[PDB]
């Protein structure tokens, strides 16, 4: 019932479940935290910005890797108007045989890609599932830099 | 071990084990005292 809202002693003394709920919803309101100065505020915001950019780059790297690994980017290059892009494969134990058959695309059940990443990456000059892997590797390196 | 075994190795791992340990840690942390 203590020590969770480390940034707020008023919440940490709450004997109810409201402390847990308000601890989540006030975690990023740095200006209202206990023992707070402006320098610490700007420094924490700066570090949070770095972590956020790292998260964005990791998300993009994950999209690239999953298109390279479980997608049909190379097949979509040769026939972009008939082949439907694949986002990533599906492994869900709750599937029946009918669901597996219906979601089956090429070798495994997979989700069609509605993000338009296939067309975007094709336009900027990507033609191989090894070009996407290089992008994922580089973006994970950039995320490490930002962290 | 082929690459197609990775989903069956990772999806249960992440989607069940990570919730369990994360719940353990979060409950322990939010139920601490001083």
């Amino acid at each position: 019932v203590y020590k969770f809202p480390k940034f707020s002693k008023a919440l940490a003394e709450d004997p109810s479940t409201r402390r847990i709920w308000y601890g989540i919803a006030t975690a990023h309101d740095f200006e209202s935290h206990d023992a707070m100065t402006e320098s610490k505020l700007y420094q924490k915001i700066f570090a949070s910005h770095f972590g956020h950019i790292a998260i964005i780059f990791l998300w993009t790297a994950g999209n690239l890797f999953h298109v390279a690994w479980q997608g049909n980017f190379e097949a979509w290059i040769l026939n972009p108007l008939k082949v439907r892009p694949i986002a990533h494969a599906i492994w869900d134990p709750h599937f029946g045989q009918a669901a597996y058959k219906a979601f089956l695309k090429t070798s495994s059940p997979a989700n069609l890609a509605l993000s338009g990443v296939y067309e975007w990456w094709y336009t900027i000059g990507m033609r191989t599932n090894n070009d996407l892997y290089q992008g994922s590797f580089f973006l994970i390196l950039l995320s490490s830099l930002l962290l | 071990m082929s690459l197609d075994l990775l989903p069956s190795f990772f999806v249960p791992l992440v989607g069940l084990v990570l919730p369990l340990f994360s719940i353990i840690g979060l409950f322990l942390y939010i139920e601490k005292e001083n």
Binding site: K44, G51, L58, A68, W69, Y133, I140, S144, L147 | -
Partner: peptide, 30 residues
């Protein structure tokens, strides 16, 4: 089709990015 080595080293590099993330997470304090 990417190889096992390609996926494995990407997983290893992802682990390194994870240790860098907790270091940033712990440095942003409890």
């Amino acid at each position: 089709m990417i190889y096992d080595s390609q996926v494995y080293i990407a997983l290893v590099i992802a682990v390194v990015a994870s240790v860098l993330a907790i270091r940033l997470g712990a440095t942003l304090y409890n």
